[PDB]
A = this chain, B = another copy of it.
Amino acid sequence: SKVLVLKSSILAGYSQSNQLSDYFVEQWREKHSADEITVRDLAANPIPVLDGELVGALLTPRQQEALALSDELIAELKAHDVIVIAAPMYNFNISTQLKNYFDLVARAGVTFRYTENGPEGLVTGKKAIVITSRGGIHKDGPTDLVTPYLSTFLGFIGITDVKFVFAEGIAYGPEMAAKAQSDAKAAIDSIVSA
C-alpha cells in the first residue's frame, strides 16, 4: 500500500500534529516496511490561495501553473491508499495551509461529479486518518466544527472511511499535554495494528 501524509501546522518542529504524524510514519514503517510513504508538508511548501484568477485556471502563466499543481495534487491523492491528514485547529477552523490544498483538490469532473441524486466523490477506496490537535477541549461539543467539516469535505470527494485521532487540551499544562500525546499515540497504535 501507499500512505500519503499531509502536514499543515505552522509551528514546524514544535508542532504537536507533526510530531504525532512522524510517530504514525515510524509506526507504519516498522509494521508495514514495504509500503511506500509520501509526506507533503503544506506549511514548508505552501499551496497558493484560491483567488479569482486561479478559480478561472481550474490561460495566464500563473493560471497554467495552478492548474498543473492542482492536477499534481489530485494525482498524488488518487495514487495513495491511506491518507493521513494533520489538522491542527486555528481559530476554530483548520489551518489555511490545509484549506488551500483542499481548494485545489476539489474539482468538478475530477474528484467529484454531479449526478441526478447529488454530487458523488470520485476518489474511491481510500482509508483516511485525521490527526487533529487543539489547545482546548472541543470534542463532541458545539465548538468543534473542524471534525464535521473534515467529514463533510472528505466525504464529498469520496473519502467516507475516516478515523479521527484527537490530541486536545494541549494548552492545559504538562499532565494534560501528556494525556493528549499518550491518548493520540494509543489511538494511532490501534490503527497501525488493526
Contact = CB atoms under 8 A, between A and B. Distances in A.
B49 A43 contact: no
A153 interface: yes
Interface string A36-71: 000000010010011110010000000000000000
Nearest to A51: B10
A139 to B, nearest CB: 14
Contacts of A11: 52, 55
Interface string A73-105: 000000000000000001111101101101100
Contact of A50 (B96, B106, B156): B96
Given A91-B106, A145-B149, A96 B52 contact: no
Given A93-B93, A102-B91, A49 B50 contact: no
A94 to B, nearest CB: 8
Q: Which 9 A-B pairs have the closest CB atoms?
A: A145-B145, A10-B52, A145-B149, A91-B106, A49-B96, A92-B153, A92-B152, A10-B51, A143-B152
